Amino acid sequence: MSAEVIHQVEEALDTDEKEMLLFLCRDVAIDVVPPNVRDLLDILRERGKLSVGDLAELLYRVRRFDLLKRILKMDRKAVETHLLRNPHLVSDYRVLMAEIGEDLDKSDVSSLIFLMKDYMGRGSKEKSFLDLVVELEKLNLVAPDQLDLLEKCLKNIHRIDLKTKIQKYKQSV
C-alpha cells in the first residue's frame, strides 16, 4: 500500500461511509480509538493488516464499488472471490450490524433507544444505530454470541426482517 491510494480513498468517501468504515474496523483495531478514517487506514497499514485485498474488502463492505473500479481497478466478483479464499478483515457480526443500521430510519432508532434505555441507563439521544451498538458493546450488552436483547428489541418494533437477519447470522455460526 501507499499514501497516494489511502489519500484518494479517504477523500473520496463521505461522512456516513467514514463512520461505517470506522465501526467495521473497531474489531481489527480494538485497542485503539482512531479519530479519523485516514489515520485508521495508516494504522492498519503499519499493523500489516492493510494489503490491496484488505482495502478492497473495506471498500466492498461500505458498498463503494465505484472506488473499487476507479482506484484499485477491481470488480465486485474479484473482491468476492478474494473473500471466499482468504480470511476476512471484518467479521460477519460487524457486517450484520451495519446491514441492520442501513434499514433503520430516525424513528426506528429513537424507538430502539427508548427500549434500550432501561437496559443501559438514561445516560445525547440523537445518535445513529452504530453509535448505539458501540455504546452497547462498551456495556457488554451485545456480542456475536449475545444477540438476544437486540433481537427482542427489533422484534418489538415490528422490524421482523431484521430479526430474521440476526437469525440467519446465528444459523451461519
Binding site: 415490528h158 422490524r159 421482523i160 426482517d161 430474521t164
Partner: protein, 179 residues
C-alpha cells in the same frame, strides 16, 4: 419481478381502496404507523417489515385484496381465483384478518350516504360532535367507537341498536357474524 408486481397492484388501488386496506390492517399496523400511509406501496412496505408480505408469503396480500372485493387484481396479478380464496380463507386458521374486522367492513359496504347520515345522528350522544363531521365515513366512526370501548368483539349492543335504527340486513350481518 416481485417488486414490479407489487407496484402494478398498487397502481390499480385508489385512495378508497387504500383506506379500506388500512382499516382491514388496523389489527397489525398501529395508528401512528398507519397515519403516514398515503399510497399502497407504503402499506406494502410496512407489511414487508412485519414479514406478512414476501415472495413466499402472498397469503395476507391475497386475503386483503379478496376482502375489499378486488377480484380483478387477484385473478390478474396474483393468479388466484375466487373459489380458491373462499376455500383458503374458510380453512380454520388461515384467515389472518379477524371476523370482527371483516364484519365491520361488510357492514360498511351496506350503508349508503343517507344511511350513514342517519348513523351519525344515532351516535350523537356517545361520540363527540367534532368527530361526527360530514367528512367522515363509517370506518372512522367504528374506530372512534372502539376508542370509547362501546364497540368490540364482546360489545356489539350499541352497534346493534344503531343498525336496527338503520336497516335490517345490517342486523342480519351482525347476527351471522355471531355464529
Amino acid at each position: 419481478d416481485f417488486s414490479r408486481n407489487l407496484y402494478d397492484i398498487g397502481e390499480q388501488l385508489d385512495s378508497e381502496d387504500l383506506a379500506s386496506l388500512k382499516f382491514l390492517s388496523l389489527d397489525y399496523i398501529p395508528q401512528r404507523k398507519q397515519e403516514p400511509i398515503k399510497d399502497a406501496l407504503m402499506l406494502f412496505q410496512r407489511l414487508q417489515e412485519k414479514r406478512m408480505l414476501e415472495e413466499s408469503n402472498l397469503s395476507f396480500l391475497k386475503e386483503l385484496l379478496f376482502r375489499i372485493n378486488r377480484l380483478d387484481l387477484l385473478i390478474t396479478y396474483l393468479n388466484t381465483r375466487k373459489e380458491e380464496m373462499e376455500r383458503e380463507l374458510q380453512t380454520p386458521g388461515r384467515a389472518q384478518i379477524s371476523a370482527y374486522r371483516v364484519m365491520l367492513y361488510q357492514i360498511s359496504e351496506e350503508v349508503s350516504r343517507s344511511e350513514l347520515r342517519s348513523f351519525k345522528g344515532g351516535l350523537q350522544e356517545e361520540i363527540s360532535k367534532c368527530k361526527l363531521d360530514d367528512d367522515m365515513n363509517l370506518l372512522d366512526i367504528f374506530i372512534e367507537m372502539e376508542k370509547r370501548v362501546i364497540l368490540g368483539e364482546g360489545k356489539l349492543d350499541i352497534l346493534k341498536r344503531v343498525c336496527a335504527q338503520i336497516n335490517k340486513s345490517l342486523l342480519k350481518i351482525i347476527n351471522d357474524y355471531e355464529e
